[PDB]
Design a protein around this nucleic acid. Structure first.
Ligand SMILES: [Mn+2]
Ligand SMILES: [Mn+2]
Length: 70
DNA sequence: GGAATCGGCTC
DNA sequence: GAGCCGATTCC
């Protein structure tokens, strides 16, 4: 029941991110990453989460595709 | 009317 | 060609 979502290791504690893989269509392989803020607002793509953080944190070394920090 | 998912357009 | 954003449909 509870899964697919994961906590953010580098971003402030509480941030959750999910990864859905397009299961419909033969072109299977396309996947999208979604991020949820502590307020409950839903976002899609790094550009959306980055705008939410504003200039408080740098996600340059943060790869949303996988959700890891370099 | 809005939200989610899927499709289309541009570089 | 792929990725991201927007539109359409149902309740
Ligand atoms: Mn034309
Ligand atoms: Mn019309």
């Amino acid at each position: 029941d509870k899964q697919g979502r994961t906590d953010c290791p580098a971003l402030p504690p509480g941030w959750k991110k999910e990864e859905v893989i397009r299961k419909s269509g033969l072109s299977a392989g396309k996947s999208d990453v979604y991020y949820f803020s502590p307020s409950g607002k839903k976002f899609r793509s790094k550009p959306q989460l980055a705008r939410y953080l504003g200039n408080a944190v740098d996600l340059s070394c943060f790869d949303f595709r996988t959700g890891k920090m370099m």
